[PDB]
């Protein structure tokens with residue numbers, strides 16, 4: 001690999017820490033970095049480091065290099081996980097990115113569900129959970145802003161889901177993945193992850209049936225992500241196995257309106273799931289629509 005002085009970071013300024021997850025596309029580890037800002041060479045910061053698994057092949061390495069190159073090109077935005085540096089010289093390939101201290105959006109919501117009626121009232125805020133409507137709307141708005149930026153850079157995500165949105169210490173939403181060379185020509189549609197996820201449930205129909213991905217396919221997934229947010233991390237198409245999902249999508253089945261969700265937001269969900277990709281909103285329109293809701297509250 002050639003040395004790119006713009007992005008290269010000395011590997012000896014990293015102290016690797018706890019693994020944050022392994023996947024098909026490598027492994028991600030928490031690390032401490034010293035002097036990420038060259039103006040403060042001894043300053044510590046917490047970053048995340050992507051690297052190859054133990055017995056990885058050439059395709060795996062090419063896949064990670066491909067990811068590195070895409071991230072260089074994408075540039076910086078508040079609502080995406082940003083590239084910080086790379087280690088390409090004299091040792092294993094490292095791709096260094098921002099660390100989002102609160103983990104992924106799905107787990108963030110599920111850990112913050114309101115207290116149930118089993119509660120015994122204790123103090124003046126027994127009924128008040130950590131999550132409020134305007135903050136949920138702000139989460140959706142931020143994801144839409146990041147997706148609008150990604151679309152402007154001609155980037156199609158292809159697995160937009162709450163699992164792939166990360167949450168910073170300041171509750172800022174950051175689109176990640178946790179994928180890139182997604183192998184769209186050999187998806188196991190029946191795949192269930194170790195946490196029980198069925199990723200086929202986020203795919204637009206034209207992607208699933210016709211293997212066509214566009215920015216409007218990501219808009220479909222965003223609708224699913226909106227449903228995730230307003231169910232506080234619920235699993236889509238509850239109780240529906242993959243075999244039945246296929247036939248229900250062919251009949252044009254859509255998820256019901258979830259409890260305690262205003263019609264404005266179920267309205268947006270159903271717009272995102274219009275059969276014709278051209279009749280779904282663009283991310284620009286979703287940003288504007290959610291902004292209006294945010295201002296009203």
Ligand SMILES: Cc1ccc(C(=O)Nc2ccc(CN3CCN(C)CC3)c(C(F)(F)F)c2)cc1C#Cc1cnc2cccnn12
Nearest residue numbers: 020048049050097098099100156157158175176177178180
């Ligand atoms: C180490 C690391 C390396 C890489 C990436 C990464 O997200 N790369 C990325 C690859 C592709 C794309 C877009 N493509 C999609 C596919 N597609 C078909 C083409 C274009 C994007 C996108 F954001 F632009 F979408 C990002 C994230 C991390 C992390 C981390 C981290 C920080 N805090 C925590 C806390 C808990 C867990 N993890 N974690």
